[PDB]
Subunit: 250 residues, 4 copies
Amino acid sequence: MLTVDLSGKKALVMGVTNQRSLGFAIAAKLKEAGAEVALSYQAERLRPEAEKLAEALGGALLFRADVTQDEELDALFAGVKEAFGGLDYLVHAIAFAPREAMEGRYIDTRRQDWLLALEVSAYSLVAVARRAEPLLREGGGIVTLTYYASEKVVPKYNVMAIAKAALEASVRYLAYELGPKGVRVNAISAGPVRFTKMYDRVAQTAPLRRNITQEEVGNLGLFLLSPLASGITGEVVYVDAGYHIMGMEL
Amino acid sequence: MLTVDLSGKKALVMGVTNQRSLGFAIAAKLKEAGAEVALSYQAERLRPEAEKLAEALGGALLFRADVTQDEELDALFAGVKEAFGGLDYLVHAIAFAPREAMEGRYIDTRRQDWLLALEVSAYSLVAVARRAEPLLREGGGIVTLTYYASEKVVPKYNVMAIAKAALEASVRYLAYELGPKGVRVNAISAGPVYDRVAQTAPLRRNITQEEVGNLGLFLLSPLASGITGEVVYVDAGYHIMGMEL
Amino acid sequence: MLTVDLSGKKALVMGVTNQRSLGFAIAAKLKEAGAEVALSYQAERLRPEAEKLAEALGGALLFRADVTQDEELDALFAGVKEAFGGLDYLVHAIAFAPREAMEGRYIDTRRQDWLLALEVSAYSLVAVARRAEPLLREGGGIVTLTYYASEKVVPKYNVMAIAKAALEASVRYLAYELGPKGVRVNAISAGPVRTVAARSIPGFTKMYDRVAQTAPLRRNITQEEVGNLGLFLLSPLASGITGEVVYVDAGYHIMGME
Amino acid sequence: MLTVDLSGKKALVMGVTNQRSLGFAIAAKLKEAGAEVALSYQAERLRPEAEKLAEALGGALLFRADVTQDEELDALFAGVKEAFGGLDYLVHAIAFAPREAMEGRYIDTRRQDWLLALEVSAYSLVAVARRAEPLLREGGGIVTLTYYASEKVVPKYNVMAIAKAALEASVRYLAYELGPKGVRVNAISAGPVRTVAARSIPGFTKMYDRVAQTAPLRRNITQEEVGNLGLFLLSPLASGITGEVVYVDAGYHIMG
Ligand code: NA
Ligand code: NA
Ligand code: NA
């Protein structure tokens, strides 16, 4: 048997607002493997849900920070440093675009909505990576979540596609800049996890003839963060039941 | 011989500040093929510079607009509509990142610098495409300029790499949204116009600005009527190489 | 207006058997631009067919060679040297897979069928490039045809997809090796066009209809759109472009299946 | 802690001739995780070599087959069926190109040499996948090896690059065809590792030097790193992943 033992390792998991988060899936696997987890939450009004998520994980530390606020990120990382002493893993599961941007056409995206989507969904990785850098230990890593709309047109994903392209390019640059410290940076491109017509359409065309599960994403994040992935950096790894390899729908 | 005659066609070229640039090179080829050209310029203090460019093209209408200002973009397109009645081609040659962002490391990029780079270098394509849409005639097109750092890490290109990744994704989505009107949207990924590029590139030389101009002309012309959503590399083959020579 | 004038230029166009073909479309644009054309034909039994093609182009020189026979390729290129003195352009429009391999599943492909498909559809480019090399003038080039199935799974395209993957990789290596002489090598990735070659692909009517409905332009491309890209790539207007796979597919390949 | 327990699982590992190989590294991680391994070997004169590999793994069944011989592959799979009943994993670590093809220029590759390289390095995956199909149990998988030269020009990788391009396209089509049975197919794109196979690639040494100098991690990868990725991909931890080319290269291929 192979064992993955992450006892003594420290993870910060950002962007989790409910148990269906792919981020929650990864945090759950990290806990199961033995790591200690800190969860960020956006604002004090959301602390109750954050407390519920921490209890759902069997225990986690909470910190308040809005990723648009540089001081609040500074305070978060000061808190992490004091509580953990250092960091091994950062899970970035932050994704946001204004509802108005996601309705209608990409060409019609308003300036402030476009910039906020990019700020929250892409720049946030840079902002947290920079602050994590002095805390991250050798062998440590950052993982983010993406979707294949970065490369292929998925109508109505709109500015989020563009944010994901910016996020994936960021992963590559950050991998180059963090690599000398022995810190790796990767993205997981996930398929949908079970509206119903969309899930069924994906399932008919995917090679595996089904949708992926939350646990499948969790397992890939565990692997990438673990020492089993020590040679892998700068990569976008697809967990999508093979869907994106298809050149037409079935 | 085959001839491409773009007489009667109307181009707006944006982002051009100098005769030795890729946007200028495209504008010049559009003129040579017979098109009329309007150039944008960013601020009225640059009017003299714009005038010298227009003269170097043998004549070009000039319109002031800073692409971060929606009201100014509205005014520009109202002006183009008034002058031309409609539009055939839009050349987006706008690229900017703050000096501080381009010094040092990408991970150290400041928030406002990052956003400004993305706003000017990528969002501007969306802002101008939306305003061009109702003016653009069947057969019309938009072309923008990019660089292979969108896909590969080029140290010191920093946030501009990320902006180009956003720009190329924008090209794909805009191609999808403008396709029903018979309007095409493409990107040209150019090499530099150094000795290391020449040593590694298959052609063992750098590309010229005229080579970029010719590709832009081809993409906007009817010869390219089946091509949309593409990133076409004009780089002497450099980017196909899996290591430096 | 821009003019494209290729008078005095010499083209060898290979793999063409019908006027409704991408290879013929490229040859037609080359002739229209002013170049002289040579067409290969596979065996003396197909000479009549080749003669009609030469006539449809308003005049072309013919040479016999089967692309699986190295000695016949040596003979064809000796003939080209004697008749033209040198060569500017080579259009590689050769594609073939046995119909036994094209029906059913890729995993069921027979050994000899797979090898022949790769031999005719990918190795042929290497074979002809090597022999064209000493004849190819500075500014010259080679263009081949490919399809999106090389990159993404298109049901029923089977071993032809794998052949096209091999062909595209060959384009990059050949661009690297021929570039220092000023010779360019590129592939055109065409969308579906009703040609006589399309009848040998079991996936066609279904993809052709899908493309019209899914592609950004909301239509299929035409053979003339392919000919025009071929003309551009071979012309001096594309002098900075080499090692590329350029798509002329109405934007189909950029789409997600939503 | 989490545990990957492959007890009761059965692997067939093909192309392995030396402990210093990526194929061997994957076989070793499979053994560590609890799977039983069978190794193929090409020719009976190589039986002693194969026996030493089996002992280095702590035990493996051995089967003779040359992947260019359809009859031999039929006999191999009959032997595997009789021994194991079924199969869970197939590791395709077969690669070959004639020396003459690998020396000098790609453009100068001779016809028979080119075809043999494609036959052994790419068609073999199809040949073995077809025969494995009826044996492979739900949750099962096939993994193969590739490298960046398939996508970008690495001088003097020549026909091996083209064969790897053919192999990666084959992975995608096979994933599509085997997926409805619940069988996954993936490729590992390894950085340069000093293996026995590395000796037959003239372009290897320039790449090996370049990776350590310029990759994000500023080092080359190890065969164990490839072994761990192969183990992950075959394991149930990767149950959502199919038709992929996953890079384990210290980030090299992302660099400009
Ligand atoms: Na909107
Ligand atoms: Na800076
Ligand atoms: Na050789």
